[PDB]
Amino acid sequence: PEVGIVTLEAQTVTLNTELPGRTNAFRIAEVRPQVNGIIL
Amino acid sequence: QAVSKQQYADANAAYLQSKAAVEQARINLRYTKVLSPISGRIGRSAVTEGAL
User: Fold this and answer.
1) Which residues of B touch A30 (CB under 8 A)?
2) Residue B49, SS3?
């Protein structure tokens, strides 16, 4: 009986995570009329 | 007898109509301030300022 073992050794690794996402407006508003009429 | 029953009727008639209108006006004004029905965490506002 034989296997393929790997010698585990202490390594120096940095811990960083990537969070995917979409950009979005900080704030949004709509422009609307509140009286009837013609746009001058 | 200074005035017919008809006149006083028409009068009290309009008076009631008014009282009615006011109450309805009051209610609509009150609804302009949207409140939270309960207490909890509120999320994103599905409506934009200026929206209709």
Assistant:
1) 48-52
2) strand
Pull the structure tokens for residue B10: 């028409």
Q: Resolution for this model in angstroms, one decimal place?
A: 3.2
Distance CA A29, CA A9 (A): 57
Interface contact B52, partner A, CB < 8 A: yes
Nearest residue of B to residue A31 by CA position?
Answer: B50
Handedness of CA A19, A24, A25, A30 (dihedral sign): negative
Residues paired with residue B49 on neighbouring β-strands, in sequence order? A29
Solved how?
A: X-ray
Residue of A24, A27, A28 to mutate when probing chain B, most B C-beta within 10 A: A28
